[model samples]
Target: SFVEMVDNLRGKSGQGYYVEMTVGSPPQTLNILVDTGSSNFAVGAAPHPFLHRYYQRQLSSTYRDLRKGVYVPYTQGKWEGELGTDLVSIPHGPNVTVRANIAAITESDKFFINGSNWEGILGLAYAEIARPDDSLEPFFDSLVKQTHVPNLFSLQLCGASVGGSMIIGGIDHSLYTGSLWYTPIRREWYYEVIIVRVEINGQDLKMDCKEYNYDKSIVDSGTTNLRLPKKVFEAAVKSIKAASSTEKFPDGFWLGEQLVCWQAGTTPWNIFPVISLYLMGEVTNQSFRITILPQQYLRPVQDDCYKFAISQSSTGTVMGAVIMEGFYVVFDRARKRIGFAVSACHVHDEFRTAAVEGPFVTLDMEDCGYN
Candidate 1:
């Protein structure tokens, strides 16, 4: 039996969830953002930095400069720095320790790292997406090999106030209900999986298979909202708006780039339309669907205002934290698969009720029609 360590690393303002990790020999605690979309463990750089919890390379004797270049690109900007090795330690979960090559950014483009609560980012994806072109192994990969741990990790996240946690090495049965549906990873990077179809209120949103192929979607906790291809996103919004009541946002509506606001309580469960995602497993070759209710899709941002954040992705669809919030997702590297189950958060009754009443669809792997 693996000893479980649960850290109360909650999300701030319903944005990103962070973990407290220590770097260097005499360890310094840094609140690092947990990102599934990336594979570079790095701290922000420069005189005008993005964090107050930066790692001091010179103060730690265990730190070694690799004299290699580092480059990490994000949706906003990029991280440029030098690669180095040091003793990385996590205070929780078997007290695992590993000496891995980490990046210390010397500079950043624009406000790439600005206004964020975290000092650094710990990429949870496979090494294929590692920065500087996969020359170095990521922290999790190195840690699992160095320590007695399964190459697995799980995430449980909710909105602000309810809190969330990251369980390393093993799964926490208490966090989820029912059996975990496992799906094989189509690609090594970005936790990629095959997406069969996307439906709204049980209606299929027709997608151009050749033009805008919606075959694969990335489960990225690092991103706060769901991102679809441009045309698909536009069609989705149009469908939602058509299904919704006439009392939509009379005022101009836009949050960040893609999110749009609407009048609170106007969109009911019947008209609001539940969003469902069908994903195919590579190993079992089965298809499983998870539905998102009105409460989960349309969230209250402020007084008398509720919003759903769905953006356009240049690459492909990405199911971010917003879609994964009420579920327990397991990333099994050893099996090269990912699993999902409806999470049970005893603290929040509203979310639990929403999940129970929401729609759910599951199909056998072999029966799923696919190439």
Candidate 2:
């Protein structure tokens, strides 16, 4: 089977992974966000107040209107678009140029942030949750059907270091080391997995295992933080309630209502504790723990201040980009499981993941699906 390695998964402000893709006959190139959380390959079709450019699909002779209207919403962020298909190719990426379904967004709200670099989002999730219905095969699905590749994809997101890549259909042995640990995917739609527990500094938070996956935790590359449910977030904050670094800040900082700035140019990285998540393993009574140091959990928004990336989710838990940068994640669709291994790009002097082949036994949490 052939593997299409999509390179240039870089973006600004640690928001989302963006890769440059071209469509239409002559191919109008645009930087597209490679998101694993959704499945609509949409681009900016019309001019918007926030976007710097939009695709002139009318000029592309190869563009075909599907005569379908699609709209997608995520909380306050949403977009409205018309469905179509065009010849899609990632320059300096896959050797194959395949025609793929796409959405030309005409209107949107809070979806495209002002001054953002990415022009659109290419969702890599399953087709069940696809906008305009599931009959439309997703971009990766279409690529697999036309090529000699299988239904497997992997991601290695090296943040700020200018290193990231997405591989479709197979794993790149050079990107990761040791055998990738397997975790049975609980649901097909969202790459959902069972989160058994959470710990701080290798010690349990003393909370129920079920609460960790209260609304279902998924591995989402689009989201910027390691999100926890309201109840779980409170406990997590209380655990590291105060440190000498944050003592100077107000309560609003921990609640995410404000950013803590140090005019003196100091960091709380050394004072923050290591956070770990215990995921249900492929085998019964087995578990795998992925741990992150303070440096990985906290993101620098400015030279004098860093924003806490651990966010409080009103609903489900999400292991977003904050947790993903340390590992090469394999979305093994054919095997119905997700595989994880430390990324070769994860050679940080202080922020290496503490996750390894280790012992953590627990009963698998049932009904952890994000329904």
Candidate 3:
């Protein structure tokens, strides 16, 4: 068992994306997205050009002054702002403590914003946040490079009532409380896992329709969920349909724990079958858990044909934040190894529509414990 880092989205708690954490002397709560997708830890300030009013800062003796206001030029976006290093405290091991030289700034929404539940991001990727080289390396990356700890990790994102977990270092021996589904990483640095072919009850689906800039791809935890080409989506949906006959709400189809039942019929109750992610010389099977909902993050329609909204030229499906419900994943930036465990949890998905699901469940990880 291992754990993977993930992007737990904050809907309107301050626009864009937000994650919550505690900071400063009194440990005031803050909302910030913990991003392993980028390097450099930074926070937003008040209503400057790029700043939002939903922010906070304490005049404590713990701020670093790696100050430098800059405007970065890029292909798609331009980030304009200043950068500074501060000694940011974090909740690490007990008695043992860990903090990072986080980059601080007055204005700029490029990195993140501030809120009551979250302060700022806990970046965990390679350098290039806001801009390349803005900071040396991400918090987790820097730790692995400097401390020589096996920085490798895994993630277990489980459903509600099942608390999620972030697996750091190597995979935890205790957490593998469930079955293990091995998937291969496509390449390095990104620590991305590849998904090659998918099957339903041993049926191979074709994904020849997906546009390809190239064959290279990676799966990320910082993102909400799984992302795949249109063809992959079609195939996955087919597999899920084949498993069940009855529709939950005639239109509402969701995948989760014991709810794989779509109709009144009993079909032996099986988990989403194994999907394959192919590397150059390797291929691994990723077992997907299917949920019933309109393919697009919208409501269901009369036609059961994945009544999704018509958007841009081509449609892409992400293994969004929901996929991590019951699995622990690892981010091994150093050796570029990624693993998974039984599960992990983030915010509730039911909150999207006010369905009144229970709060996040504490994980019964009696098997795993941090050292």
Using lDDT as the measure, the top candidate is 2
List, residue by residue over 1-371, the lDDT tens digit for candidate 3: 12222333343311223444444544544455545454556555445443333334455355455555544332112235455443333343111123455544444434332333344555565554435464455666555555545757555444421224454565665654444434444344444444333334446564441221123344444454444554455456566665544444243333211122223333223333433322211121222322222222221222222222211112233343444434455555554444443442322333221111111222221111111
TM-score per candidate, chains pooled: 0.86, 0.91, 0.58
* Clashing residue pairs found in predicted model 1: 285-365, 286-365
Poorly placed runs, candidate 3 (over 4 Å): 1-31, 47-58, 70-81, 92-116, 128-130, 145-149, 178-185, 208-216, 234-318, 344-371
lDDT of 1 by residue, 1-371 (tens): 32345544665644577877888978978777788989999875345545675778888899999998988888756778889999887776556688987888777775234566777778988888897776579889898889888889888876643367788888999888977877778669889876656788778875643222344468898887788877778888788878875546442343333345446544344666678777764433346677776666555564244556666787778788778888888998888888888887522434323332222343443332223
Question: Model 3 lDDT vs. the true structure?
Answer: 0.40
Clash count, one per candidate: 2, 0, 71
- Which 10-residue window in model 2 sums to the lowest lDDT? 362-371
The global C-alpha lDDT for each of the candidates, from Candidate 1 onward, is 0.71, 0.79, 0.40
Output the better candidate (1/3) by lDDT.
Answer: 1
Which residue window of length 10 is worst by lDDT in model 1?
351-360
Residues 174-248, candidate 2, lDDT per residue (tens digit)?
788876888888877877888777888667887776677887778888888888988899888877664444466
